[PDB]
């Protein structure tokens, strides 16, 4: 009688601590490479922002009328997304995106702002809607008559809810000092936003500038996070784009960027621009910027784990 062990004709090569490319009777991958070119959203409350810019869901541009108050588990930004109407920019934007991306969604509630001696129309063909209008969760406070004079106005809000509040406001940058002393009064314009742990002040910069989407002026939006029971104070005299409503986060959620279709048939937790990495392996070589609950990204394309003795063919 003799006793031995098995073996196959064509083994599988692996790497040991001492050798390289040793044949074992059988191995198995460890670095996922398979990708699913779709956003596996089964079971998750999804919201594909589409042509709406994640930030635009806070201000209110036409592209976002359908997203001013959304609930979700998975948010999705598209390259075609835009958070703008009137040419302009969002100061310290990516930070805001990072917050809203996990906000779970937003919930609007007025600021309780009423005014006097001024107009509150202020629209623009740049912000086309129902035939020329303005943002949505905004109000372009305007000086009554032309070249008039905007008052010492002051408005203030108090977040009286458990969780902090997202407060926005914009500064208008006319395309000239002439258009400025027209829309609002004349002279220096100062907008100062203050709260418990915040306090900046802004000044308009009216003057020559390209003409994007029909306008040469610019409205740049600013933002802070209002703590529970805290009070925000706005002190301005024009050029101020006031906030009609505040925002509150609904809770957990994740935001991703993809250019691929949504699919509610498969399930994934590791998303990335071009699909979902569906795998139970520890490492992936697909995308180093994948997000969610993923396998760690490595350089190697394959790290094979022996699952059998060494192979010794006859």
């Amino acid at each position: 009688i003799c006793l031995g062990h098995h073996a196959v004709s064509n083994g599988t090569k692996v790497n040991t601590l001492t050798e390289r490319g040793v044949e074992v009777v059988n191995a198995t991958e460890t670095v996922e490479r398979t990708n699913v070119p779709r956003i596996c959203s089964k079971g998750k409350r999804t919201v594909d922002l589409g042509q709406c810019g994640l930030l635009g869901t806070i201000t209110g541009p036409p592209q976002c009328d359908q997203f001013l108050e959304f609930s979700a588990d998975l948010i999705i930004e598209r390259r075609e997304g835009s958070d703008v109407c009137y040419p302009g920019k969002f100061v310290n934007e990516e930070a805001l995106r990072q917050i809203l991306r996990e906000s779970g969604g937003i919930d609007k509630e007025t600021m309780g702002f009423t005014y006097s001696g001024i107009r509150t129309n202020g629209a623009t063909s740049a912000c086309r809607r129902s035939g020329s209008s303005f943002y949505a969760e905004m109000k372009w406070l305007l000086s009554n008559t032309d070249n008039a004079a905007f008052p010492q106005m002051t408005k203030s809000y108090k977040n009286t809810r458990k969780d902090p509040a997202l407060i926005i406001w914009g500064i208008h940058h006319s395309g000239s000092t002439t258009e400025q002393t027209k829309l609002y009064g004349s002279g220096n314009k100062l907008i100062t936003v203050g709260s418990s742990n915040y306090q900046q002040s802004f000044v308009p910069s009216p003057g020559a500038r390209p003409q994007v989407n029909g306008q040469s002026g610019r409205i740049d939006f600013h933002w802070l996070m209002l703590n529970p029971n805290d009070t925000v104070t706005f002190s301005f005299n024009g050029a101020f784009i006031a906030p009609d409503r505040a925002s509150f986060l609904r809770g957990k959620s994740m935001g991703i960027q993809s250019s691929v279709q949504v699919d509610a048939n498969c399930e994934g937790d590791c998303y990335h621009s071009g699909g979902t990495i569906i795998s139970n392996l520890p490492f992936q070589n697909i995308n180093s910027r994948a997000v969610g609950k993923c396998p760690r990204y490595v350089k190697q394309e394959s790290l094979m784990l022996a699952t059998g003795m060494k192979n010794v063919p006859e």
Partner: protein, 166 residues
């Protein structure tokens, strides 16, 4: 292999032993025969299935993303972010290769052991009724018929009964 068994004093393995991992191949009076040994095989398999399990776990750790594929973030902060991400990539890649390379070493050795475990079982079993040649075979000094060869397999061989007669 640390035990000098597999890929050692047992030249090659048996490509016909598709029944188990290890097994017995005898040549008694009548005819031969080759049967796999369930005991040892399951012992190894189980353990190896162990590692594989240990390695297939859930990184319940969720990372939100901080970059931007559309609209790039500022340059200074951007390079810092990536300098960081790569450092992390360099690390995990290193870990990933050491784990697998290390695990494997162990895996292979793990079998030698089991194989050697069996061999030492058969030896001590046969007591002083057989001799140890060196190729991994046990030349039994007495007609060990099919019922006998197998007697050894299922660990029931009572050397004594054939002690003197050996």
């Amino acid at each position: 292999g640390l035990f000098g068994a597999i890929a050692g004093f047992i030249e090659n393995g048996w490509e016909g032993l598709i029944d188990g991992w290890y097994g017995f191949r005898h040549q008694n009076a009548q005819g031969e025969g080759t049967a796999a040994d369930y005991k040892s095989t399951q012992s190894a398999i189980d353990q190896i299935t162990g590692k594989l399990n240990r390695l297939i776990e859930k990184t319940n750790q969720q990372f939100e993303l901080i970059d931007n594929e559309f609209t790039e973030v500022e340059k200074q902060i951007g390079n810092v972010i990536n300098w960081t991400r790569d450092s992390m990539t360099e690390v995990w890649s290193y870990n990933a290769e050491l784990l697998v390379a290390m695990e494997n070493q162990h895996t292979i050795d793990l079998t030698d052991s089991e194989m050697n475990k069996l061999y030492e079982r058969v030896k001590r079993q046969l007591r002083e009724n057989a001799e140890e040649d060196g190729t991994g075979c046990f030349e039994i000094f007495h007609k060990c018929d099919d019922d006998c060869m197998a007697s050894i397999r299922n660990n029931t061989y009572d050397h004594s009964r054939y002690r003197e007669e050996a």
